[PDB]
Design a protein around this ligand. Structure first.
Ligand code: PEE
Ligand code: SF4
Ligand code: SF4
Ligand code: SF4
Ligand code: SF4
Ligand code: FES
Ligand code: MG
Ligand code: ZN
Lengths: 48, 125, 208, 97, 230, 96, 115, 371, 176, 112
């Protein structure tokens, strides 16, 4: 997080390179975020 | 200014209905019966026109209920039996008409519950 | 009538009643009935022969002058001898008022086109012809406006099926879009929602 | 906005406006994404007593339209649909654009 | 002839002697609310949902049991009759369980529909409801007793139509319950009809349980072939 | 409580399994079959029966307005236990 | 009695001359329509289709219905001559993709419940 | 959107213009006859999919008039506030798309950023960015979240600079003026006869605004001016729409400062559903929730024509009820229908490229035209 | 009250005419538009770095559907069919029967994602909050068939998203 | 004299009193041929006589605008021409006559 950025760019995620069974060094997607961090990352709550 | 032609009305050639959905269907004109689960009679006031039931099969995927006739859900409402008959005749559909069923008047008496000599007397209330 | 009930306005009711009586007096040849609703809406029931006169009066009279046609539509009631009813909604900017004129017709009797009285009516009558099959006499160019080319029947009519009679797909053998009889994968579910135990005693009908 | 002073002056001059007062990008000023629970006041009909529904039934006070001159059944001053509409006033806040 | 004149909402109607207020209202086209009255059963008068105002009379009468008198002007949509209907509906719903989603008589409930058309839109009952234990009367009629409103339609049908005196009321007042008082199956060739006459989900069909909602069903009029009665 | 069909498919909580001669299993080749591993019947069977010293007990599923409608259960019948019509929880009076 | 308002005609003779007039226009148009839409059909079988469509409505004995059908036919002519329709709209008259539905009793008995 | 247009041109000039419509005819009016009133509400979001809550408001007003009830004051204030926000959205869409078709293409992005912010407002209030279904025929569905008014105020105190930038790009540009001035001139009598409404009237000097002459929710409690044109060309209508955006900002300010407390739907459980807690605790509330979400409410028989001053013009509905819980007839009157009908006369003696400008200034969306 | 938008009259003195001629010949307003664009270039853009950054949402947001269950682990659905009745698009199909323990449970609960309009009427009609429209929106598919959900798929979605769904319901249930 | 009435296509009519008087006189002349008992004749004669009295009793044009309750004398002239055209067309129409025919027994019965 970085609260000095404008709303929308103040939170971000760096994806892992190896999720359940695939190499995710390049092939990242938004479905890889677990529900709790999904709620935090989409600004549905202020609490991680 | 007036033709004054004498002939029964027939609009089948103008409605766009396919031929096999005119001469083959059999409509029913009736007053719907009262649902015996309830005692209300507001649903037995008008006349209804409905078509005959056709094949309904099971969808190979997800097992939904598939049909092939367009007139499965078509139900029309009329004020009188004559209006429905006229509509069916002018639209070229063969029809079966059923006379309206009316619950006959009944003789109700509370005191008859507590009868002196008759069988009507109730054992409990 | 505490806050949840819509307030009434008797001044507008009186004004609309008086104006309805006025219009009824001036045109007794065509005007068959005049009504004012409980929410202050004036509708005038006329003969089919009086479409061109009455509308013209309502457009041109100094007292009425309804110069704008808000909407022209049709309603289908299969139980009536005259199947379709034609509804004209007019707005008067000079007096800040609205009026409604109702007419009747059946499948074969044409209704006089009111394109001369209102330019706005031309598309409206095209849509009425497309969806209900009501022919309008002396229309500049009466043809389908919303349905597909070559479409058979009128969709808005009560008898017409919700999903129609034909459906479209693409065929590779003929390499084009073709039409076949409708075959739904899942049939539309019909719900019987009307309850017994009538809701509104004020609209109860005689038992005949 | 993390903009240098010279770039701020350049954009202010080229636009002709002071941009920093009204930035189009949202910052800290917006409301927090987590809020306290509300309470929400109840309606007028909630009263325990003297609240019979027949006294507050709007649908049951609707009636069929009044019929005047059913054709099946004096000076006489002329009348209009409603009183003539008054002309508008010329917006004594900025009448001309 | 022997017909007497009575007025329903100021409208004259000619009726036979002994005709009830409810039937006089029927002849003009109105259906009086009811839960315990049935045409085929004997009059009970227990529910009090048929209470209507007779003009120039201070007390409301039970329309299902009171014979109409000559010159009476019934006031069916009067304020007094509406208030009586709301009060009776409130009393009926005070102890009723919040079982509508799990009740097999969701869209076919006379209680629900008459609440919608003649009752109030809210409750002022701040107490706890009661619960009675269910009874077992065989494999055909599923009994969920808390829902029952003590109309006594089932008892009257069993005693008069089915000819079986197995059903009765036990206890007194609020705790009075409809049943058999012993583990005993009410089994007869006419046993299923008590499901239809029961206005609530107290008596439901056991083979039909949980399968369909009434608004979904398509109704086909047909003829029975299980016997020669047709 | 997921079981296995004789042919080899997983039997769902509803109990539907394609029969050996059913062609419709061809849709599962090179793919999988969506089966939920948590069976609600077993999970509600694992719940202990609550002990209350009341003749009538109320249940709303827990959570207040986040549960089901509040219902009242009678506990007079000592042979069985009172069961909630919505949540499935069981209640019992302190016998002996 | 049964007095009814005219649309265009008063008797079946005016209706017949309108039908004939409409028919001639369609006949002239078919060769041109076939060429312009690059249809794989011949002019002969196109005109046979025209004949079949006109014969479909040959049992009408009412001038209002007849001249309303004439109005609809004139609307169709309009759509074709102005090229508002496409190849698919014209080929919808021939039903080249629909399987042939048998008419005899035994075949209908074998296929399904539909009479 | 999608439009087929058949025209005959003598050299450069357009002799005749004919629009062929029905490419987005989905049969909404027939489908409405198979739904309850609550079930039929979401169709109006789809009718004019640039101005959603205005259609919601028109339908809700029609159903309320037929039901003989009225919404609570807070619901009406919320309705007017979100209607003005919807007006801002629609006018941004119209002006930026007009410029994009003509060729400016920069204010399109400039103002769709603000459009994204307003979809954020919609989503926060309803959970849906553009088809919220928030305005119900008894009020609104849910109350505003606790931090929404502050964010609306913060947004609305910066929008005037965006309008000013748009004007810097457009109002004084000689190319834009040459493209729009003296194009599609319509006289007041012709506009009145052809059925035009909204800006298409006010561009010709006609002083008519439904929020002033026939106020409907609380519009008689807010103060704003009605921009009036003088030449009946595309430039006058563009200026009128910009001034309407400014007046919408004014109305939004007034609505923000005068939001009252109270409930959000009519306290009549036979029309508006009760609260979840009441449904889960009270027998009557549960019965009414069941019946309102299975059968719906019955509407007394009658026919009404309810019209509102929508962003595109007079948007109306002729609603016919037969006494059941399903509408018997629903006719939808969209201003785009009449405007496209008059396009033929509007584009007489003009260049081929002027038809694009006339279509843009008519503010045509084919969802409401075809229905 | 009404305003005039284009009711100004240009001055005809020599200075005004010379000013207008200078505007015509030297393209002053074109330079003003250029300056506006140039200034607007030197400000920070509004683009976010998707998928590493996400757009803001709300607890009320309507996404993918899910079937929830009680903390004990039994499903909340009681087969009342109110969601099916209210569904404006007829996207829900339900079949039910008594369970082996006598419970009132569904045997079929299908939602067609390609007929759904994502209005949320189903989740607000639900008496026991069995069906909810969760926060997921990134569930695009390569075939039409995988967008036809059955009961198992919806229960799996509920088990997958229950934490966030419960948090959102906790945040928003006091407005309902 | 004012310019640019504000309504596009509506030109300023200089010396409007004469135009109004001519239009009202022609309206009355057309109305005279209508049967005396017709309601349209007497109503339109009453309205036209009132308007002619006000225009003859007021030389000012703005005061005439305020008195006539139409405003913008040009559109009052336009309404006078529309009334004259309607009078001619409606003399041709003759609507003062009795209703042509009654509707079907239940033509206007709602519901059903
Ligand atoms: C004492 C001895 C001196 C001798 C006399 C010399 C004096 C010179 C005074 C006059 C010189 C001015 C000439 C410059 C060209 C003027 C042409 C012109 O004005 O035409 C315009 C047209 O101009 C345009 O519209 C062009 C706009 C095209 C868009 C380009 C954007 C402009 C900004 C880009 C920057 C320009 C950079 C220029 C330098 C380039 C260096 C290589 C008129 O069109 P309208 O206003 O529509 O009116 C016509 C109807 N009656
Ligand atoms: S009997 Fe009727 S009121 Fe009682 S729970 Fe069942 S549906 Fe609801
Ligand atoms: S079980 Fe049903 S019929 Fe019998 S008394 Fe109870 S409510 Fe009445
Ligand atoms: S969100 Fe709306 S359309 Fe989708 S399943 Fe639920 S009720 Fe049906
Ligand atoms: S409304 Fe809820 S409990 Fe009822 S069937 Fe739908 S998901 Fe199940
Ligand atoms: S119906 Fe009369 S007391 Fe029950
Ligand atoms: Mg029962
Ligand atoms: Zn429980």
């Amino acid at each position: 997080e970085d609260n000095k950025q404008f709303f929308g760019r103040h939170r971000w995620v760096i994806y892992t390179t190896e999720m359940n069974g695939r190499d995710t060094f390049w092939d990242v997607d938004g479905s890889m975020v677990p529900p709790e961090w999904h709620r935090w990352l989409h600004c549905m709550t202020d609490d991680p | 200014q007036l033709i004054a032609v004498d002939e029964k009305l027939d609009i089948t050639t103008l409605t766009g209905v396919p031929e096999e959905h005119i001469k083959t269907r059999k409509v029913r004109i009736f007053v719907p019966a009262r649902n015996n689960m309830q005692s209300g009679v507001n649903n037995t006031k008008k006349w209804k026109m409905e078509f005959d039931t056709r094949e309904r099969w099971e969808n190979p995927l997800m097992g939904w209920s598939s049909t092939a006739d367009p007139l499965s859900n078509l139900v029309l409402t009329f004020s009188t039996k004559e209006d429905a008959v006229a509509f069916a005749e002018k639209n070229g559909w063969s029809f079966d008409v059923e006379e309206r069923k009316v619950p006959k008047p009944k003789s109700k008496s509370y005191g008859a519950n507590f009868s002196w000599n008759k069988r009507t007397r109730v054992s409990t209330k | 009538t505490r806050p949840t009930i819509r307030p009434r306005n008797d001044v507008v009711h009186k004004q609309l009643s008086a104006f309805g009586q006025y219009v009824a007096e001036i045109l007794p040849k065509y005007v068959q009935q005049v009504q004012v609703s409980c929410f202050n809406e004036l509708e005038i029931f006329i003969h089919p022969d009086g479409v061109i006169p009455v509308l013209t009066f309502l457009r041109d009279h100094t007292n009425a002058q309804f110069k704008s046609l808000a909407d022209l539509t049709a309603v289908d009631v299969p139980t009536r001898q005259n199947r379709f009813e034609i509804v004209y909604n007019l707005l008067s900017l000079r007096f800040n008022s609205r009026i409604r004129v109702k007419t009747y017709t059946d499948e074969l009797t044409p209704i006089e086109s009111s394109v001369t009285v209102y330019k706005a009516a031309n598309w409206y009558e095209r849509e009425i012809w497309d969806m209900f099959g009501v022919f309008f006499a002396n229309h500049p160019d009466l043809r389908r406006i919303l349905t597909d080319y070559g479409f058979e029947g009128h969709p808005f009519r009560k008898d017409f099926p919700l999903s129609g009679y034909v459906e479209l797909r693409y065929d590779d053998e003929v390499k084009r879009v073709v039409a076949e009889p409708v075959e739904l994968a899942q049939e539309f579910r019909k719900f019987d929602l009307n309850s017994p135990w009538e809701a509104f005693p004020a609209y109860r009908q005689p038992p005949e | 906005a993390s903009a240098t002073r010279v770039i701020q002056l350049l954009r202010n001059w080229a636009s002709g406006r002071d941009l920093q007062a009204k930035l189009q990008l949202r910052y800290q000023e917006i409301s927090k994404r987590t809020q306290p629970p509300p309470k929400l006041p109840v309606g007028p009909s909630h009263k325990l007593s003297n609240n019979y529904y027949c006294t507050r039934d709007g649908r049951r006070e609707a009636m069929p339209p009044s019929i005047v001159m059913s054709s099946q059944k004096t000076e006489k001053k002329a009348v209009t649909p409603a009183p003539p509409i008054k002309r508008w006033e010329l917006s004594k806040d900025q009448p001309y654009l | 002839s022997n017909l007497i004149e009575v007025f329903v909402d100021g409208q004259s109607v000619m009726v036979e002697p002994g005709t009830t207020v409810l039937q006089a209202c029927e002849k003009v086209g109105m259906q009086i609310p009811r839960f315990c009255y049935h045409e085929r059963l004997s009059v009970a008068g227990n529910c009090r949902m048929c209470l209507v105002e007779i003009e120039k009379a201070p007390k409301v009468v039970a329309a299902c049991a009171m014979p109409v008198m000559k010159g009476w002007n019934i006031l069916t949509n009067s304020e007094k009759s509406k208030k009586a209907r709301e009060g009776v509906m409130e009393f009926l719903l005070a102890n009723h369980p919040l079982d509508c989603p799990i009740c097999d008589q969701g869209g076919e409930c006379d209680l629900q529909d008459q609440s919608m058309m003649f009752g109030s839109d809210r409750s002022r009952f701040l107490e706890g409801k009661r619960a009675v234990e269910d009874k077992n009367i065989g494999p055909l009629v599923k009994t969920i007793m808390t829902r029952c409103i003590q109309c006594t339609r089932c008892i009257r049908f069993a005693s008069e139509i089915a000819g079986v005196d197995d059903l009765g009321t036990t206890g007194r007042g609020n705790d009075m319950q409809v049943g058999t008082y012993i583990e005993k199956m009410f089994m007869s060739e006419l046993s299923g009809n008590i499901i239809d006459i029961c206005p609530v989900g107290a008596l439901t069909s056991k083979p039909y349980a949980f399968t369909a909602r009434p608004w979904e069903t398509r109704k086909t009029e047909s003829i029975d072939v299980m016997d020669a009665v047709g | 409580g997921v079981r296995t069909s004789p042919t080899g498919e997983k039997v769902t909580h509803t109990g539907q399994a394609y029969d050996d001669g059913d062609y419709r299993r061809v849709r599962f080749s090179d793919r999988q079959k969506e089966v939920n591993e948590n069976f609600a019947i077993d999970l509600i069977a694992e719940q202990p029966v609550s002990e209350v010293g009341s003749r009538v007990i109320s249940c709303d599923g827990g959570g207040g307005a986040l549960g089901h409608p509040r219902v009242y259960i009678n506990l007079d019948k000592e042979t069985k236990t009172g069961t909630c019509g919505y949540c499935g929880l069981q209640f019992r009076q302190p016998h002996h | 009695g049964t007095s009814v308002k005219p649309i265009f005609s008063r008797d079946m003779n005016e209706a017949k001359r309108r039908v004939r007039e409409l028919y001639r226009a369609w006949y002239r148009e078919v060769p041109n329509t076939v060429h312009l839409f690059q249809l794989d059909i011949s002019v002969k079988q196109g005109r046979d289709k025209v004949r079949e469509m006109f014969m479909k409505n040959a049992h009408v004995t009412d001038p209002r219905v007849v001249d309303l059908l004439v109005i609809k036919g004139k609307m169709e002519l309009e759509e074709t001559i102005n090229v508002w329709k496409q190849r698919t709209h014209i080929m919808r008259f021939f039903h080249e993709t629909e399987a042939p539905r048998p008419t005899d009793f035994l075949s209908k008995f074998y296929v399904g419940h539909d009479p | 959107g999608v439009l087929r247009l058949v025209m005959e041109l003598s050299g450069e000039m357009v002799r005749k213009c004919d629009p062929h419509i029905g490419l987005l005819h989905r049969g909404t009016e027939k489908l409405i006859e198979y739904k309850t009133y609550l079930q039929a509400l979401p169709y109006f979001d789809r009718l004019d999919y640039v101005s959603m809550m205005c259609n919601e408001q028109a339908y809700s007003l029609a159903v309320e008039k037929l039901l003989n009830i009225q919404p609570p004051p807070r619901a009406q204030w919320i309705r007017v506030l979100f209607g003005e926000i919807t007006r801002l959205l629609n006018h941004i869409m119209a002006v930026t798309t007009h410029a994009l078709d003509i060729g400016a293409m920069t204010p399109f992005f400039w103002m769709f950023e603000e459009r994204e912010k307003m979809f954020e407002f919609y989503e926060r209030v309803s959970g849906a960015r553009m088809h919220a279904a928030y305005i119900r025929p008894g009020g609104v569905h849910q109350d505003l979240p606790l931090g929404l008014l502050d964010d609306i105020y913060e947004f609305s105190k910066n929008f005037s600079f965006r309008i000013d930038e748009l004007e810097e790009m457009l109002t004084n540009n000689r190319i834009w003026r040459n493209r729009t001035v003296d194009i599609g001139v319509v006289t007041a009598e012709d506009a009145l006869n052809y059925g035009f409404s909204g800006v298409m009237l006010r561009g010709s000097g006609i002083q008519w605004d439904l929020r002033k002459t026939q106020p409907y929710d609380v519009y008689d409690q807010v103060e704003f001016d009605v921009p009036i044109g003088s030449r009946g060309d595309c430039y006058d209508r563009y200026l009128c729409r910009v001034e309407e955006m400014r007046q919408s900002l004014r109305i939004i300010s007034q609505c923000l400062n005068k939001m009252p407390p109270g409930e959000i739907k009519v306290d009549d459980a036979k029309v508006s559903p009760p609260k979840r807690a009441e449904m889960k605790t009270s027998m009557e509330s549960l019965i009414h929730h069941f019946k309102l979400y299975t059968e719906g409410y019955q509407v007394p028989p009658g026919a009404t024509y309810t019209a509102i001053e929508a962003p595109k013009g007079e948007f109306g509905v002729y609603l016919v009820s037969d006494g059941s819980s399903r509408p018997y007839r629903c006719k939808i009157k969209a201003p785009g229908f009449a405007h496209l009908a008059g396009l033929d006369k509007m584009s007489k003696g003009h260049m081929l490229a002027d038809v694009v400008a006339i279509i843009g200034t008519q503010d045509i969306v084919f969802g409401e035209v075809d229905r | 009250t009404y305003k005039f938008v284009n009711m100004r009259e240009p001055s005809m003195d020599m200075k005004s005419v010379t000013d207008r001629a200078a505007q015509t010949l030297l393209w002053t307003e074109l330079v003003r538009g250029l300056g506006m664009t140039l200034s607007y270039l030197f400000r920070e853009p509004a683009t976010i770095n998707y998928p590493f950054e996400k757009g803001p949402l709300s607890p009320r947001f309507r996404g993918e559907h899910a079937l929830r269950r009680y903390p004990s682990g039994e499903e909340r659905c009681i087969a009342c069919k109110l969601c099916e009745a209210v569904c404006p698009a007829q996207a829900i199909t339900i079949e039910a029967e008594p369970r082996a323990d006598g419970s009132r449970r569904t045997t079929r609960y299908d939602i067609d994602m390609t007929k759904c309009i994502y209005c949320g009427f189903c989740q607000e009609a639900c008496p026991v909050d069995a069906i909810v429209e969760g926060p997921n929106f990134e569930f695009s598919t390569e075939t039409h068939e995988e967008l036809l959900y059955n009961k198992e798929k919806l229960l799996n979605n509920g088990d997958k998203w229950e934490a966030e769904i419960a948090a959102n319901i906790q945040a928003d249930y006091l407005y309902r | 004299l004012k310019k640019t009435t504000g309504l596009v296509g509506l030109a300023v009519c200089e010396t409007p009193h004469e135009r109004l008087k001519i239009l009202y006189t022609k309206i009355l002349d057309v109305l005279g041929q209508i049967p005396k008992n017709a309601a349209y004749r007497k109503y339109t004669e009453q309205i036209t006589n009132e308007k002619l009295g006000m225009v003859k009793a007021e030389p000012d044009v703005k005061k005439l605008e305020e008195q006539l309750q139409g405003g913008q004398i040009e559109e009052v002239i336009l309404q006078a021409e529309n009334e004259l055209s309607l009078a001619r067309k409606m003399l041709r129409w003759k609507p003062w006559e009795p209703l042509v025919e009654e509707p079907p027994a239940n033509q206007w019965k709602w519901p059903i």
